[PDB]
């Protein structure tokens, strides 16, 4: 039976370390901060039942910040063509 005292007595206990967007010691933005801001802006007043449904797009945006599965896979897709074109010369621009 999860009880909420800390909202009742009006005291913060664990709310400070809870999510990335909280006020930092000397405010330094977290890597994915802004997308926390939009995921909580989307899912704030709703019940996590339909937040699943309707906040999906922006949530997946947040995930793609955190884990970086898709973009990492993209860079990989770049070296995978680069590789087989070491054979067929594309030369290099850089010095």
């Amino acid at each position: 039976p999860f009880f909420d005292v800390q909202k009742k007595l009006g005291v913060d206990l664990d709310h400070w370390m809870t999510i990335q967007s909280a006020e930092q010691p000397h405010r330094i933005p977290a890597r994915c901060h802004a997308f926390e801001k939009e995921w909580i802006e989307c899912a704030h007043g709703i019940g996590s039942i339909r937040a699943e449904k309707e906040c999906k797009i922006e949530f997946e945006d947040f995930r793609e910040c955190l884990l970086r599965q898709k973009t990492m896979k993209r860079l990989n897709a770049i070296k995978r063509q680069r590789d087989k074109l070491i054979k067929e010369g594309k030369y290099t621009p850089p010095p």
Binding site: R31, A34, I57, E58, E60, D61, E64, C65, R68, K70, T71, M72, R74, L75, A77, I78, K79, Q81, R82, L85, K90, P93, P94
Partner: protein, 71 residues
């Protein structure tokens, strides 16, 4: 000053990435032109993987692992 200089440097670098990518990836299996991967288009910081890559690998050593173990 350091801020303006820096951000110009990184934008230059990312565009160079864009043109190289454009030359290499011409072929049938088009992902078309260089795109963000997010469902919402707005500025988001580079990964430092995106910036430094294909770079000869010398300065990814000192840039990525450089600061740790000092100079």
């Amino acid at each position: 000053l350091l801020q303006a200089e820096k951000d110009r440097r990184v934008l230059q670098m990312l565009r160079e990435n864009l043109e190289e990518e454009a030359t290499i990836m011409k072929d049938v299996p088009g992902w078309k032109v260089g795109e963000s991967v997010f469902h919402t288009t707005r500025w988001v910081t580079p990964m430092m993987g995106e910036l430094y890559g294909l770079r000869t690998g010398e300065e990814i050593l000192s840039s990525t692992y450089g600061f740790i173990w000092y100079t």
